Write a protein that binds this ligand. Structure first.
Ligand SMILES: NC(=O)c1ccc[n+]([C@@H]2O[C@H](COP(=O)([O-])OP(=O)(O)OC[C@H]3O[C@@H](n4cnc5c(N)ncnc54)[C@H](O)[C@@H]3O)[C@@H](O)[C@H]2O)c1
Ligand SMILES: NC(=O)c1ccc[n+]([C@@H]2O[C@H](COP(=O)([O-])OP(=O)(O)OC[C@H]3O[C@@H](n4cnc5c(N)ncnc54)[C@H](O)[C@@H]3O)[C@@H](O)[C@H]2O)c1
Ligand SMILES: O=c1ccn([C@@H]2O[C@H](COP(=O)(O)OP(=O)(O)O)[C@@H](O)[C@H]2O)c(=O)[nH]1
Ligand SMILES: O=c1ccn([C@@H]2O[C@H](COP(=O)(O)OP(=O)(O)O)[C@@H](O)[C@H]2O)c(=O)[nH]1
Ligand code: NA
Ligand code: NA
Ligand code: NA
Ligand code: NA
Ligand code: NA
Ligand code: NA
Lengths: 339, 339
């Protein structure tokens, strides 16, 4: 399958390290029923967590991960909740006292975030602030946030919100609360992504819609990205921004052609539809030549400076009432070049 | 198909009546990407709405209905939003000024709402209040809420929340703001329902899990239920509680057996697993012998009395802070017999 062909197959997956990190912990996963969150849930069970708290605002997604894990039902708790509800979220953290939060809840579709910039800011930045503030206040030991290559020199609302989330969480890290952020590229077959779209086009006898003949992305299997995230979390001392080695770039045109070849539907045309607002032809390569090595060849540590939280909290207040979100974001992230 | 075998096939579907109701209207659908909401969106387009505003808090679900309707993209707006966000929801209504709201956003899984009663109250009752209040304040002409057979003599948190939503929305109806509620039973193949669960069990060569050998539900295809909801909306003068004729009940054991015979998978066992907290063996029959007829043999009008909104608003304020939600809901819905 195409997934098989584009897998990273990292040489440096380390089950025993992850097991050491997770064994007998109470772990809360935000966005637990999502593509990444569901895999984080599954790996938390595999690697020996004592109790998994699954937080998701999407009832079907929560239903589904809870059902998927039914054999482990005594060790999991489905919490049907938005992380924007600070009071209820605080009650959850007090009741279950997680030692580790794995934060995988966000809105991620670049076009939808361009069309709904306020909701992107609220869900991504304010949601991350609420969850982090609650985690730190309730003495959660370690907080790992999932991030994206789109956060680097961002050209879209989504990527810029994720950069703000990095700045916020990393600036919260201290001697008691250890924060790691982990950046990676596209996950093969994730919700609402290009592979399922092309599968659906082929099955409906529709031409494949390709944005641009030269567009490329970096890809990893969800199980690879997630285990590497957990390895990074395990080694984190707090305040690290990690980046994953995604291997070679994949041209989307080659992906489309391979999918057509694999389903013997070279009858179908590939139609070029054009780059969208804020969409990059080539996302930024994740690992910089000066990033620090770790013991895992797939994981590097990128440079980051804390920002003052008083300043950042004031700017986050501004994002919620300002006229021009794009302009407000640029004040926080001066490298933001919107579309 | 099992779907085909259990379809109602109502004799009284009326495309031209629905077209007359929807042609050239600006319509907003809450829960637009859900099972029912997505079909509402599709039928809004089919029957000639001018502009469809699709509101959903689930990004994948919103992405998907928006993609499904790509051929009509110039007539649709994807709004990524929770209906709990009053300020942003008010901005949407002020901007687009819909003439009709079709309210299909709720949490519906009985076990999840038993486990998360506060979130059920907030999402279902408070969300409905916020949307209905915003709709009336913004001079929306007509408001149609989707309801359930589980709202009749409810035995679970979900059913009770939906009964409170009926009471609230119907009590808001006036000469200028016409509300209709439409009760119906199970939609075949809906998200997270029995048919997909049995399909997944059979695909994984697992025994089908049947809750009780005598359990029954009433079923309809989504297209039939939705068109009847729209026919009900079309004839409503405000204040009506409508009920659909679902036909004969279906024993779930017979459904399981038929799926096995159709999949040619009689090698698999049906295992009895037990009733769940608050789960009925037989839902209440929807049509009372004294319900009024309409021109559609599938649609009846049930009796309902308005309640005082000052009292119901106070009780809703209390539900948000109280410690015993079951007890509190009983004070609003005296017929609630929890579990
Ligand atoms: N999929 C990718 O290619 C990719 C790559 C790198 C980073 N990421 C990041 O990974 C994370 C998840 O991506 P995904 O592909 O799993 O997306 P997804 O939409 O499938 O999963 C996100 C989950 O979070 C939940 N959620 C969203 N907002 C929430 C809220 N306020 N409260 C509670 N739950 C909420 C959603 O219902 C969903 O189940 C995101 O932070 C994304 O930004 C994704
Ligand atoms: N499926 C059935 O068998 C059935 C039968 C009778 C009545 N109903 C009622 O129909 C409605 C939808 O049921 P469904 O089967 O389509 O469920 P669903 O979960 O598939 O759809 C509900 C949609 O509403 C959205 N949503 C939920 N809360 C929201 C919020 N706060 N803001 C914005 N969006 C929100 C969800 O993301 C989802 O896409 C519900 O009101 C349910 O209570 C369902
Ligand atoms: O219908 C599609 C959808 C996506 N893409 C491209 O496929 C890549 C992956 O898109 P996806 O939506 O999966 O993820 P994103 O990179 O936007 O997170 C990007 O280069 C898109 O422009 C495409 O060519 N056609
Ligand atoms: O694994 C399952 C799931 C459901 N059901 C039954 O199938 C019917 C429909 O369940 P569903 O969850 O689809 O909808 P609900 O009626 O709870 O809204 C009910 O009688 C359930 O008890 C079952 O026997 N096994
Ligand atoms: Na090892
Ligand atoms: Na899955
Ligand atoms: Na459990
Ligand atoms: Na007609
Ligand atoms: Na569909
Ligand atoms: Na559009």
């Amino acid at each position: 399958s195409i997934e098989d062909l584009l897998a990273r197959k990292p040489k440096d997956l380390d089950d025993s390290a992850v097991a050491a990190f997770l064994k007998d912990k109470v772990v809360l996963v935000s966005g637990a029923g999502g593509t990444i969150g569901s895999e984080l849930c599954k790996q938390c069970i595999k690697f020996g967590a004592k109790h998994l708290i699954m937080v998701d605002h999407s009832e079907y997604n929560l239903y589904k991960i809870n059902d998927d894990l039914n054999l482990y039902k005594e060790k999991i708790t489905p919490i049907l909740l938005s992380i924007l509800d600070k009071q209820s979220l605080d009650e959850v953290l007090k009741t279950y006292k997680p030692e580790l939060i794995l934060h995988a809840a966000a809105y991620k579709h670049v076009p939808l975030c361009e069309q709904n910039p306020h909701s992107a800011v609220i869900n991504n930045i304010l949601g991350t602030k609420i969850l982090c503030d609650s985690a730190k206040e309730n003495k959660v030991a370690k907080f790992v946030m999932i991030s994206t290559d789109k956060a680097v020199r961002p050209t879209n609302i989504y990527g810029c919100t994720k950069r703000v989330c990095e700045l916020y969480t990393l600036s919260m890290s201290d001697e008691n609360f250890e924060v790691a952020c982990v950046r990676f590229g596209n996950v093969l077959g994730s919700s609402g992504s290009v592979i399922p779209k092309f599968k659906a086009q082929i099955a409906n006898n529709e031409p494949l819609t390709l944005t641009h003949p030269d567009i490329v992305r970096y890809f990893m299997l969800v199980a690879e990205a997630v285990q590497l995230v957990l390895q990074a979390g395990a080694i984190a001392k707090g305040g690290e921004l990690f980046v994953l080695d995604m291997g070679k770039p994949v041209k989307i045109i080659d992906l489309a052609k391979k999918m057509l070849l694999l389903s013997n539907r070279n009858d179908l045309e590939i139609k070029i539809t054009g780059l969208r607002k804020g969409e990059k032809l080539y996302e930024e390569l994740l690992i910089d030549e000066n990033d620090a090595k770790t013991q895992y060849e797939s994981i590097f540590v990128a440079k980051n400076e804390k920002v003052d939280l008083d300043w950042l909290n004031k700017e986050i207040e501004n994002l919620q009432i300002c006229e021009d979100i794009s302009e407000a974001l640029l004040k926080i992230v001066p490298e933001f070049k919107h579309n």
